[PDB]
Amino acid sequence: MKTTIKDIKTRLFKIPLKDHFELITTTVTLEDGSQGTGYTYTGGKGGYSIKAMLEYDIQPALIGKDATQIEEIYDFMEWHIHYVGRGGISTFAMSAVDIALWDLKGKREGLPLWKMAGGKNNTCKAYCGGIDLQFPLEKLLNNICGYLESGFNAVKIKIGRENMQEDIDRIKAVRELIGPDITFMIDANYSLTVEQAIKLSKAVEQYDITWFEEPTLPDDYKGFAEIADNTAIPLAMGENLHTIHEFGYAMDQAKLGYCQPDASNCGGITGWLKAADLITEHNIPVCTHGMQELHVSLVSAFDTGWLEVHSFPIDEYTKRPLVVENFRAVASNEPGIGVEFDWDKIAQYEVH
Amino acid sequence: MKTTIKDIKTRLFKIPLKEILSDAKHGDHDHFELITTTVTLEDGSQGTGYTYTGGKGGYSIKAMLEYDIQPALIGKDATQIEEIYDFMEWHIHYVGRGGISTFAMSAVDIALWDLKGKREGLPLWKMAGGKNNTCKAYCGGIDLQFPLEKLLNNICGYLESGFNAVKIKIGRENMQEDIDRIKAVRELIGPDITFMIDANYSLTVEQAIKLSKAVEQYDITWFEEPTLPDDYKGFAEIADNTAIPLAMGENLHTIHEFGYAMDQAKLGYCQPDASNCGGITGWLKAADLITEHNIPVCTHGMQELHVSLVSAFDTGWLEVHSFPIDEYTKRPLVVENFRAVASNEPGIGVEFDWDKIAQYEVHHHHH
Ligand SMILES: [Mg+2]
Numbered sequence: 001m002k003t004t005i006k007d008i009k010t011r012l013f014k015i016p017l018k019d020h021f022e023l024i025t026t027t028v029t030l031e032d033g034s035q036g037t038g039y040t041y042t043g044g045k046g047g048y049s050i051k052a053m054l055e056y057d058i059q060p061a062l063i064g065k066d067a068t069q070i071e072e073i074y075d076f077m078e079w080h081i082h083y084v085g086r087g088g089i090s091t092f093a094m095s096a097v098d099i100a101l102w103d104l105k106g107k108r109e110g111l112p113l114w115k116m117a118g119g120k121n122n123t124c125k126a127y128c129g130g131i132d133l134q135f136p137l138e139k140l141l142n143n144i145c146g147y148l149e150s151g152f153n154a155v156k157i158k159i160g161r162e163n164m165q166e167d168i169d170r171i172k173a174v175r176e177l178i179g180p181d182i183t184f185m186i187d188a189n190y191s192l193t194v195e196q197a198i199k200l201s202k203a204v205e206q207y208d209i210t211w212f213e214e215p216t217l218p219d220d221y222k223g224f225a226e227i228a229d230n231t232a233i234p235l236a237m238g239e240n241l242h243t244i245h246e247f248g249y250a251m252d253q254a255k256l257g258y259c260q261p262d263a264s265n266c267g268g269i270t271g272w273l274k275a276a277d278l279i280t281e282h283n284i285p286v287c288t289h290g291m292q293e294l295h296v297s298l299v300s301a302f303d304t305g306w307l308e309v310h311s312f313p314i315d316e317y318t319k320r321p322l323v324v325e326n327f328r329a330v331a332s333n334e335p336g337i338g339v340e341f342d343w344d345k346i347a348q349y350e351v352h
Numbered sequence: 353m354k355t356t357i358k359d360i361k362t363r364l365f366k367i368p369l370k371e372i373l374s375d376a377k378h379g380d381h382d383h384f385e386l387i388t389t390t391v392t393l394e395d396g397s398q399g400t401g402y403t404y405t406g407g408k409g410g411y412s413i414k415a416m417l418e419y420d421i422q423p424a425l426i427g428k429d430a431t432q433i434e435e436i437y438d439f440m441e442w443h444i445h446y447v448g449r450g451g452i453s454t455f456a457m458s459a460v461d462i463a464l465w466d467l468k469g470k471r472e473g474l475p476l477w478k479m480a481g482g483k484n485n486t487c488k489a490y491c492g493g494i495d496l497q498f499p500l501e502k503l504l505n506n507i508c509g510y511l512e513s514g515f516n517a518v519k520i521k522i523g524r525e526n527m528q529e530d531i532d533r534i535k536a537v538r539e540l541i542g543p544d545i546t547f548m549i550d551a552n553y554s555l556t557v558e559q560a561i562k563l564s565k566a567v568e569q570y571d572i573t574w575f576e577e578p579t580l581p582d583d584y585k586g587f588a589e590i591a592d593n594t595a596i597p598l599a600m601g602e603n604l605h606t607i608h609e610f611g612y613a614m615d616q617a618k619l620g621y622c623q624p625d626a627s628n629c630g631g632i633t634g635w636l637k638a639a640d641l642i643t644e645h646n647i648p649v650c651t652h653g654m655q656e657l658h659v660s661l662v663s664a665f666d667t668g669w670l671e672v673h674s675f676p677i678d679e680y681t682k683r684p685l686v687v688e689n690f691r692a693v694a695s696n697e698p699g700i701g702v703e704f705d706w707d708k709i710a711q712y713e714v715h716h717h718h719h
């Protein structure tokens with residue numbers, strides 16, 4: 001059958017940073033020879049685990065099937081590895097496959113992802129964050145000036161030192177530099193307690209902080225609600241939510257103002273849409289985490305939230321690095337997911 | 353340090369099953385998968401823990417252990433099982449919060465507890481709570497495709513094996529079939545045998561209600577995973593409209609997820625599985641939580657390790673799973689007057705017959 005899945009190949013790359021992040025490619029070949037690649041990525045752990053799952057648990061089960069029936073295959077995968085699923089490694093792996101199918105669906109239908117995911121805009125608000133917690137203060141600000149002159153009107157910094165006061169300092173430093181008009185967000189990486197967080201959001205309400213990202217453990221939905229009810233800075237989370245249920249819980253109880261689903265680990269573009277469709281119902285901004293190359297097509301598709309521009313140069317090893325027109329990420333009109341890996345450049349980082 | 357971690361060796365086994373086992377959502381089952389993890393110290397000390405699966409995930413569990421966790425563990429004090437376990441959570445967090453990650457963590461932590469026992473010279477049931485060395489138990493079968501005669505004969509075997517409680521799978525497209533097979537099992541075992549059911553998260557809320565209603569008359573001790581274990585509210589709705597107590601737990605991989613259950617699911621019985629919710633340390637954290645909500649601490653799979661744990665808390669039941677891990681152990685499960693007998697050797701009470709399972713080792717290989 002024309003669209004029947006004939007082969008699937010999955011490669012793992014260790015790519016250096018500035019220490020290193022993982023990239024997992026997954027290429028689906030069809031009957032008529034059409035190809036499509038999807039991917040997922042990591043901050044350094046579980047690359048092998050993801051590739052093992054794909055290569056033993058999921059891929060051989062997928063050979064034979066019709067690549068056009070993507071919801072079907074998605075659903076099938078979720079039940080197939082359920083015992084060792086319900087999030088974790090299993091969802092990275094699922095994403096990689098689902099994205100490649102979306103890619104074939106794009107090339108097949110001659111449509112770019114931004115129109116495929118709903119097509120409400122081809123451009124979107126963006127903002128830069130860094131792996132900046134350990135950074136000396138002057139080093140941080142010189143970095144942020146960099147972002148502002150590259151063409152971005154919003155920045156973000158990590159907070160969460162045992163020395164709380166050092167954090168309120170760095171937040172005030174950045175607001176001085178950027179002035180009234182540039183947007184400011186903070187991300188705590190679930191290092192705070194509820195009461196620790198409430199301390200900090202109270203201490204910096206004055207700096208027009210646009211959101212407080214993952215203030216406490218993301219598994220603490222009541223926690224967030226306790227925070228938000230003692231706080232006037234909008235709460236944000238999503239990175240680490242891997243299941244449409246986990247997003248369900250977040251809307252139901254977490255009282256969030258901004259939600260950031262990551263297509264690479266909440267089950268690809270099918271899952272991401274599940275999440276974004278949900279978030280929209282709750283009249284909340286649809287934002288994203290990591291994977292700028294892909295997500296620009298997705299944020300722009302719902303036109304409502306921020307595209308996070310992450311440190312990982314995943315886009316530096318593709319054909320089209322993120323494109324900015326005045327303070328806005330621009331999405332590719334090329335059919336597919338609008339991402340296409342520079343195979344020759346990453347080939348040196350492939351592993352095993 | 354004399355109990356620093358030296359080398360940690362992890363093995364995969366694809367162990368076949370005497371026959372094909374089916375249930376409502378996992379399809380078929382011709383083998384299960386075993387993962388063994390041996391932690392060695394600076395004084396020759398050797399502890400070994402394990403986890404299992406229904407045939408999927410083994411390579412993925414070995415991979416995670418071999419690259420992401422094992423190297424980061426070497427040169428820590430095996431005594432600090434609290435610290436090493438707290439460490440593993442944050443270490444793989446980005447690709448964690450359950451799923452493959454907690455299987456991984458469980459094998460390692462159970463090793464550390466096998467060391468803590470051998471080093472302290474204590475049996476698990478004392479370590480895990482002490483409150484008893486024997487415990488109630490029931491036989492589960494992954495038996496949904498077995499025609500009615502085979503299911504009954506097979507059940508006739510569980511009674512004759514010295515057991516006073518049994519469970520059967522339900523989840524057929526035709527609800528009537530499941531009703532007629534429950535009615536049958538009750539008619540075969542008489543009033544005195546405890547009887548449970550298990551639908552493997554295969555029903556809609558409406559279906560679980562209709563089903564539970566049409567069979568409450570057969571004195572069903574609990575109703576295991578009627579619906580998705582992520583639909584806590586779903587569990588609420590079912591419990592609010594039916595009499596037979598609800599049970600879940602075997603798919604909950606996080607202390608938070610058990611929290612959600614106790615908070616919302618309105619469960620009568622909960623079933624932590626040490627193999628996949630953070631080993632013995634996590635199991636206790638969850639058993640403790642299950643206890644404070646005045647719910648009987650039961651158990652899923654891995655009969656030879658849990659017999660210690662259900663005994664130790666002495667409030668719930670021990671499942672005699674259909675993956676006969678204990679048969680490739682040196683000590684098969686021991687039943688005395690319808691009760692499970694916890695091992696008294698120091699450690700976890702489990703020591704595999706490496707010679708027997710040796711023929712079943714798998715090894716990665718190359719694509
Ligand atoms: Mg964050």
Ligand SMILES: [Mg+2]
Nearest residue numbers: 550552576577
């Ligand atoms: Mg069950």
